Design a protein around this ligand. Structure first.
Ligand SMILES: *[C@@H]1O[C@H](CO)[C@@H](O[C@@H]2O[C@H](CO)[C@@H](O[C@@H]3O[C@H](CO)[C@@H](O)[C@H](O[C@H]4O[C@H](CO)[C@@H](O)[C@H](O)[C@@H]4O[C@H]4O[C@H](CO)[C@@H](O)[C@H](O)[C@@H]4O[C@H]4O[C@H](CO)[C@@H](O)[C@H](O)[C@@H]4O)[C@@H]3O)[C@H](O)[C@H]2NC(C)=O)[C@H](O)[C@H]1NC(C)=O
Ligand SMILES: *[C@@H]1O[C@H](CO)[C@@H](O[C@@H]2O[C@H](CO)[C@@H](O[C@@H]3O[C@H](CO[C@H]4O[C@H](CO)[C@@H](O)[C@H](O[C@H]5O[C@H](CO)[C@@H](O)[C@H](O)[C@@H]5O)[C@@H]4O)[C@@H](O)[C@H](O)[C@@H]3O)[C@H](O)[C@H]2NC(C)=O)[C@H](O)[C@H]1NC(C)=O
Ligand SMILES: *[C@@H]1O[C@H](CO)[C@@H](O[C@@H]2O[C@H](CO)[C@@H](O[C@@H]3O[C@H](CO)[C@@H](O)[C@H](O)[C@@H]3O)[C@H](O)[C@H]2NC(C)=O)[C@H](O)[C@H]1NC(C)=O
Ligand SMILES: *[C@@H]1O[C@H](CO)[C@@H](O[C@@H]2O[C@H](CO)[C@@H](O[C@@H]3O[C@H](CO)[C@@H](O)[C@H](O)[C@@H]3O)[C@H](O)[C@H]2NC(C)=O)[C@H](O)[C@H]1NC(C)=O
Ligand SMILES: *[C@@H]1O[C@H](CO)[C@@H](O[C@@H]2O[C@H](CO)[C@@H](O)[C@H](O)[C@H]2NC(C)=O)[C@H](O)[C@H]1NC(C)=O
Ligand SMILES: *[C@@H]1O[C@H](CO)[C@@H](O)[C@H](O)[C@H]1NC(C)=O
Ligand SMILES: *[C@@H]1O[C@H](CO)[C@@H](O)[C@H](O)[C@H]1NC(C)=O
Ligand SMILES: [Ca+2]
Ligand SMILES: [Ca+2]
Ligand SMILES: [Cu+2]
Ligand SMILES: [Cu+2]
Ligand SMILES: [Cu+2]
Ligand SMILES: [Cu+2]
Ligand SMILES: [O-]
Length: 558
């Protein structure tokens, strides 16, 4: 029986609460949550701001798919039906650690082959051994930029009481060009501005006024949970609610001790759960997106993207207080979040070495102009020959573009200094994302404006003081600063092939990623006959389909 109430959100059930180590213990509900998702391709689709898009790719006929709802401890089973015309697809459950279920991670070329179009299907099955807000999206090149996105809401305890859960609130850049058109563009030009920003799938057009603002209703006097998600392909957002603060209670899938802020930076793929108290004069208030960092991590052709938060009982119409711009967040996420379930990372004798350093670089000396590399190699996988097929067939002859980084030893700690192109003339902020794990942010280069051109190259002597293992930020996306660095660590507790990549679609398309091959021998030993059978069958189906495809693979595949 549940003990989770508005006044006691910390409690879940007997023996299970906000302090439970959810990486060890989850309720055994015995419950399965089956879902079916169907992808379709639509030409000349009238979008939410009135502009007709040449082509979109939708989950259940929307550019935001159905939300995957579950409770902590449930089993989730998602049948994905690919009714696109030519593209394969693979659906990644972003933020779900897939503990012991690597082959359900949905990373084509890594953990599976793509699902063939015109009716291909597969069933993903995984456990809700975490709770909080996540999202799902295609990993088939930049396909999710066409609309193959949705939210995940796994209910469980929380670090603050609240009366009402308002639900998921995904915010996304929106382009009139297709994802494939934008990959082609960004091979030889920088990232463009978004045409608009959609809040829960809607917005007004900045010139015509067609469309509608998202409209979120607050109950006067009450505390409301809002589940923010940046589902963009490139835009990084600063969000703020006029005349209201937001109290953070979770970052990505990790509950944190409450932190009240006036505005919030959401990198691509980041989530924040916040509590908003409706304690102001009843009215209508803008929920604004703004951009900082010299627009180096996004801008939009809509100068004032916004939603409306409406107090129940107040008048209708638009807010009248335009509010003030928030502080410039410098394309940086919060460095001081504190997980409720605290952990210490050993930091005794850490030093920079070839085997714990990964340099992100941009190579502009060839064709295409923008080639992204990690440790000197642009990632490039073969959709028909996924990493885990090499592991299972005991083939160690990975192509160089697979960017395999071996991580061995059960329960080892794996440390990584990520450097942003030391010495380069121009660098960009990067939202770095690890599959299969939360990582720990041990430190990063001093906060700067990314437009300041102030360089920081990690100096092991000088910069040890910037590193700490005392309950570090723990999450699954964090920012690599322009002209700087970040040190990350994770525990080798999950045998699998795990992508680690920049979540800007143009960058991972263009080569910015590696594959952590974690405990490969253990992975081979743990993969069930059923998982191996399903891998092999889908890969056979994909390989039979691929030569009939009218289009080439245009990029890394990721
Ligand atoms: C963006 O657009 C999307 C799409 O239109 C919007 O999605 C909607 O989001 C709603 C909020 O998540 C969601 O409502 C939920 O729907 C499901 C039905 O499938 C239902 O389970 C939920 O019902 C709960 O919440 C309502 C209040 O809304 C309660 O009246 C109700 O009794 C349920 O309360 C229980 O669950 C809550 C968490 O969901 C708890 O906060 C609550 O305390 C209570 O939990 C206790 O009881 C449980 C059972 O006894 C127990 O397990 C637990 O431990 C506790 O003891 C709710 O109605 C819509 O379904 C969803 N619509 C779609 C189409 O997806 C979204 O809102 C938009 N975003 C914004 C910001 O506007
Ligand atoms: C996302 O969208 C999909 C649709 O694209 C939703 O799934 C559909 O759900 C509706 C109900 O909401 C169903 O509509 C009914 O269909 C009845 C006939 O169903 C049989 O025939 C279908 C056509 O051949 C066939 O697809 C279907 O198979 C499905 O269910 C079987 C039973 O579990 C299973 O063997 C298959 O895996 C397959 O999933 C049946 O054999 C009809 O009599 C009713 O009048 C009504 O129209 C659809 O059948 C569903 N389609 C599919 C493919 O599942 C899905 O719920 C949406 N998801 C969310 C989260 O909203
Ligand atoms: C956002 O959604 C809310 C619903 O949650 C809308 O609020 C509703 O707004 C209408 C007016 O647009 C209110 O009705 C009005 O009431 C007055 C007095 O009773 C009456 O004189 C008017 O003729 C009209 O009927 C309604 O009360 C209100 N509902 C709630 C629960 O507050 C709001 O309009 C939406 N905003 C936008 C921009 O769409
Ligand atoms: C939060 O979002 C809202 C909604 O987009 C922003 O409101 C907009 O603010 C701009 C800037 O002042 C307004 O433009 C001005 O319009 C007037 C009237 O046409 C004109 O005289 C000025 O020269 C200027 O163009 C705009 O009208 C207004 N939009 C709406 C619908 O009211 C708000 O500024 C945002 N706040 C923050 C802090 O970003
Ligand atoms: C996935 O489907 C899209 C949409 O049809 C394909 O996109 C086209 O790709 C060609 C070749 O690069 C371009 O000339 C077109 O401009 C693209 N069209 C649109 C609307 O974007 C894409 O090639 C497909 N990918 C695969 C691997 O099949
Ligand atoms: C970086 O690449 C070199 C080969 O160019 C390789 O020897 C080294 O092991 C790589 N480092 C990592 C961490 O993968
Ligand atoms: C192992 O992989 C390499 C590279 O993809 C391939 O050329 C070779 O044929 C594979 N070996 C076997 C036995 O399949
Ligand atoms: Ca260079
Ligand atoms: Ca078999
Ligand atoms: Cu993701
Ligand atoms: Cu992910
Ligand atoms: Cu990047
Ligand atoms: Cu990914
Ligand atoms: O991802």
């Amino acid at each position: 029986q549940s003990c989770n109430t508005p006044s006691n959100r910390a409690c879940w059930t007997d023996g299970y609460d906000i302090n439970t180590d959810y990486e060890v213990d989850s309720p055994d509900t015995g419950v399965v949550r089956p879902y079916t998702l169907t992808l379709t391709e639509v030409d000349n689709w009238t979008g939410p701001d009135g502009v007709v898009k040449e082509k979109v790719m939708l989950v259940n006929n929307s550019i935001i798919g159905p939300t995957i709802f579950a409770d902590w401890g449930d089993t989730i089973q998602v049948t994905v039906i690919n009714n696109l015309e030519t593209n394969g697809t693979s659906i990644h459950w972003h933020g779900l650690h897939q503990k012991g279920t690597n082959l359900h991670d949905g990373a084509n070329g890594i953990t599976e082959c793509p699902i063939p179009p015109k009716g291909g299907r597969k069933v993903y099955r995984f456990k809700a051994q975490q709770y909080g807000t996540s999202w799902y999206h295609s990993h088939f090149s930049a396909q999710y930029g066409n609309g193959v996105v949705g939210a995940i809401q796994i209910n469980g305890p929380a670090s603050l009481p609240y009366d009402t859960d308002l639900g998921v609130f995904p915010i996304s850049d929106y382009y009139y060009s297709s994802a494939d058109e934008l990959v082609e563009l960004t091979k030889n030009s920088g990232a463009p501005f978004s045409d608009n920003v959609l809040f829960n799938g809607t917005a007004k057009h900045p010139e015509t006024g067609e469309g509608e603002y998202a409209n979120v209703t607050l109950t006067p006097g009450r505390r409301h949970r809002l589940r923010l998600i940046n589902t963009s392909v490139e835009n990084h957002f600063q969000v703020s609610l006029v005349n209201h603060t937001m109290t953070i209670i979770a970052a990505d899938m990790v509950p944190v001790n409450a932190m009240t802020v006036d505005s919030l930076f959401l990198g691509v793929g980041q989530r924040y759960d916040v509590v908003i108290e409706a304690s102001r004069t009843p009215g209508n208030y803008w929920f604004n997106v703004t951009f900082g960092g010299g627009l180096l991590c996004g801008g939009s052709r809509n100068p004032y993207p916004a939603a409306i938060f409406h107090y129940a009982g107040a008048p209708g119409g638009p807010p009248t207080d335009e509010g003030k711009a928030p502080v410039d967040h410098n394309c940086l996420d919060l460095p001081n979040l504190k997980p409720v379930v605290a952990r210490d990372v050993p930091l005794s004798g850490f030093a920079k070495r070839p085997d714990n350093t990964l340099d992100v670089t941009l190579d502009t000396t060839g064709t295409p102009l923008f080639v992204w590399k990690v440790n000197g190699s642009a990632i490039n996988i073969d959709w028909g020959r996924p990493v885990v097929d090499y592991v299972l067939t005991q083939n160690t002859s990975f192509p160089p573009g697979y960017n395999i980084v071996e991580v061995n030893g059960a329960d080892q700690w794996s440390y990584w200094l990520i450097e942003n192109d030391p010495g380069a003339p121009f660098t960009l902020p990067h939202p770095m994302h690890l599959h299969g794990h939360d990582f720990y942010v041990l430190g990063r280069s001093p906060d700067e404006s990314p437009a300041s051109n102030e360089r920081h190259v990690f100096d092991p002597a000088r910069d040890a003081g910037l590193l700490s293992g005392a309950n570090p930020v723990r999450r699954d996306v964090t920012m690599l600063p322009a002209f700087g660095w970040v040190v990350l660590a994770f525990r080798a507790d999950n045998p699998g092939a795990w992508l680690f990549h920049c979540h800007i679609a143009w960058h991972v398309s263009g080569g910015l990623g590696v594959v952590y091959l974690e405990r490969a021998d253990d992975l081979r030993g743990a993969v069930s006959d059923a998982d191996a059978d399903d891998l092999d069958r889908l890969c056979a189906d994909w390989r039979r389909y691929w030569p009939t495809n009218p289009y080439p693979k245009s990029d890394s595949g990721l």
